[PDB]
Ligand binder design. Structure first.
Ligand SMILES: *[C@@H]1O[C@H](CO)[C@@H](O[C@@H]2O[C@H](CO)[C@@H](O[C@@H]3O[C@H](CO[C@H]4O[C@H](CO)[C@@H](O)[C@H](O)[C@@H]4O)[C@@H](O)[C@H](O[C@H]4O[C@H](CO)[C@@H](O)[C@H](O)[C@@H]4O)[C@@H]3O)[C@H](O)[C@H]2NC(C)=O)[C@H](O)[C@H]1NC(C)=O
Ligand SMILES: *[C@@H]1O[C@H](CO)[C@@H](O[C@@H]2O[C@H](CO)[C@@H](O[C@@H]3O[C@H](CO)[C@@H](O)[C@H](O)[C@@H]3O)[C@H](O)[C@H]2NC(C)=O)[C@H](O)[C@H]1NC(C)=O
Ligand SMILES: *[C@@H]1O[C@H](CO)[C@@H](O[C@@H]2O[C@H](CO)[C@@H](O[C@@H]3O[C@H](CO)[C@@H](O)[C@H](O)[C@@H]3O)[C@H](O)[C@H]2NC(C)=O)[C@H](O)[C@H]1NC(C)=O
Ligand SMILES: *[C@@H]1O[C@H](CO)[C@@H](O[C@@H]2O[C@H](CO)[C@@H](O[C@@H]3O[C@H](CO)[C@@H](O)[C@H](O)[C@@H]3O)[C@H](O)[C@H]2NC(C)=O)[C@H](O)[C@H]1NC(C)=O
Ligand SMILES: *[C@@H]1O[C@H](CO)[C@@H](O[C@@H]2O[C@H](CO)[C@@H](O)[C@H](O)[C@H]2NC(C)=O)[C@H](O)[C@H]1NC(C)=O
Ligand SMILES: *[C@@H]1O[C@H](CO)[C@@H](O)[C@H](O)[C@H]1NC(C)=O
Ligand SMILES: *[C@@H]1O[C@H](CO)[C@@H](O)[C@H](O)[C@H]1NC(C)=O
Lengths: 50, 49, 209
């Protein structure tokens, strides 16, 4: 939305009331831990491929 | 090969896995369904000082 | 005449059991919402075979009894023949032409086995004749039915044309298969419950992607 602050060199704007806002912030920390095997993934139950 | 309980359709012969690998078979003499599992897992963890 | 296919003609592409997956496979399928030729029986013209035939039939007393296949069909080369004489099913590949028997008051291969809708898919792949079928108690109805394989034969002869056989004392539909990619939904019991034709509209292309 277009706004225009009414600026002049003798006028100020002071709040007379307030509000208390509780906002939410979501942050990732860790991810899934995985582990791999060579022979079970690549060949798998194969002696000559191992 | 292990005894299984999968509900194969009468025209179906093999069952396929997520990796499109053969997971279940049908024995051509006795029409039963057998699951295929790996031999043995090799990765064990060793906790030592 | 012509009529809409209405998402029919989906068969089982192989003998593989899959449970609760979405599988994208490319094979000879009937395209969705396509034109199929409608013939009415109160005529059996000679029609080509192309890459495969989806043959649907709406009947109540099994007027259509079988089909004849071949390239020339004039007792010159091998001509396949499927005949159901209401007791058993006879498969022949002999050259001899037989007239249709009214039901009022040399070859080396031979095999002996509106309320109804019978759907069949015939295709000849690497010299093997494959017949898939599905019979259901009922333009084609707009429902999804999976065609299970029944007949596999090592025939070998090329087939370029075909013709149906009527029990001359009901209607049928003929469509042609095309190489298409289909996304099939296998449920918990290995039954194809729904399918998506990947080259129909951009929404189904997005679904297949
Ligand atoms: C500075 O700002 C604060 C809050 O922003 C003001 O303090 C009080 O604010 C409350 C809430 O507005 C006033 O209480 C009553 O609000 C009712 C509306 O309730 C709805 O909105 C609130 C959230 O604002 C929801 O929690 C609620 O569930 C409702 O959805 C009005 O209907 C009330 O009016 C009734 O009482 C007055 C008397 O107070 C009568 O004159 C009316 O006719 C009617 O019967 C009421 O307004 C509370 O009144 C405010 N306090 C005071 C002292 O006014 C401050 O007022 C504000 N300014 C300053 C200088 O601090
Ligand atoms: C393949 O051939 C084998 C034969 O080696 C067939 O197995 C046979 O199946 C029949 C099924 O009726 C068995 O008969 C019954 O078996 C039960 C349980 O054993 C018994 O209680 C009955 O009294 C009766 O004998 C038969 O025993 C069995 N034979 C063997 C050696 O297992 C098998 O069915 C054939 N498979 C196909 C697909 O053709
Ligand atoms: C309709 O078609 C059927 C299918 O051919 C005809 O029935 C008879 O089917 C048998 C299938 O077993 C054919 O084979 C013969 O069987 C006998 C006994 O089983 C056997 O001893 C023979 O050696 C041979 O294998 C049989 O040829 C066939 N009968 C005829 C006359 O061809 C049936 O006749 C057809 N017509 C009607 C009106 O049902
Ligand atoms: C896959 O097929 C199996 C069949 O082995 C389904 O399991 C059972 O299916 C029946 C319906 O056919 C469910 O209803 C039950 O029917 C019986 C017989 O009519 C009736 O006596 C029971 O009171 C009940 O109504 C049954 O709950 C179900 N059982 C289980 C454990 O699932 C299975 O539902 C099929 N899965 C699909 C279609 O996803
Ligand atoms: C009909 O019978 C004849 C004779 O049995 C078949 O002829 C084949 O002829 C070629 C060359 O002349 C031979 O090499 C083949 O061995 C013959 N076939 C057999 C089975 O012996 C002819 O193909 C037969 N036609 C049909 C449609 O069966
Ligand atoms: C398909 O069928 C419709 C309706 O019968 C017809 O207008 C159209 O020309 C047909 N298209 C082809 C390619 O046969
Ligand atoms: C089918 O056609 C191909 C190419 O036209 C030919 O090589 C083949 O021999 C034919 N099949 C038979 C059984 O004659």
């Amino acid at each position: 939305a277009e706004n225009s602050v009414a600026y002049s060199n003798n006028s100020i704007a002071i709040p007379t009331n307030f509000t208390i806002s509780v906002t939410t912030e979501i942050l990732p920390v860790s991810m899934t831990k995985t582990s791999v095997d060579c022979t079970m993934y690549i060949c798998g139950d194969s002696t000559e491929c191992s | 090969l292990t005894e299984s309980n999968k509900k194969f359709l009468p025209f179906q012969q093999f069952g396929r896995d997520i990796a499109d690998t053969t997971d279940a078979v049908r024995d051509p003499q006795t029409l039963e369904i057998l699951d295929i599992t790996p031999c043995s897992f090799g990765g064990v963890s060793v906790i030592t000082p | 005449a012509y009529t809409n296919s209405f998402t029919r003609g989906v068969y089982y592409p192989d003998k593989v059991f899959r449970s609760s997956v979405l599988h994208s496979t490319q094979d000879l399928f009937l395209p969705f919402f396509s034109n199929v030729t409608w013939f009415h029986v109160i005529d059996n013209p000679v029609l080509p075979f192309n890459d495969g035939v989806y043959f649907a039939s709406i009947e109540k007393s099994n007027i259509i009894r079988g089909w004849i296949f071949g390239t020339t069909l004039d007792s010159k080369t091998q001509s396949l023949l499927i005949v159901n004489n209401a007791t058993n099913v006879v498969i022949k590949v002999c050259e001899f032409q037989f007239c249709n028997d009214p039901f009022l008051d040399n070859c080396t291969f031979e095999y002996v086995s509106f309320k109804n809708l019978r759907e069949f898919v015939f295709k000849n792949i690497d010299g093997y004749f494959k017949i898939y079928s599905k019979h259901t108690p009922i333009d084609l109805p707009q429902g999804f039915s999976a065609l299970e394989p029944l007949v596999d034969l090592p025939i070998g002869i090329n087939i370029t044309r075909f013709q149906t056989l009527l029990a001359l004392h009901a209607a049928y539909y003929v469509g042609y298969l095309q190489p298409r990619t289909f996304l099939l939904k296998y449920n918990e019991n290995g039954t194809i419950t729904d399918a998506v034709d990947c080259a129909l509209d951009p929404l189904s292309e997005t679904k297949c992607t």
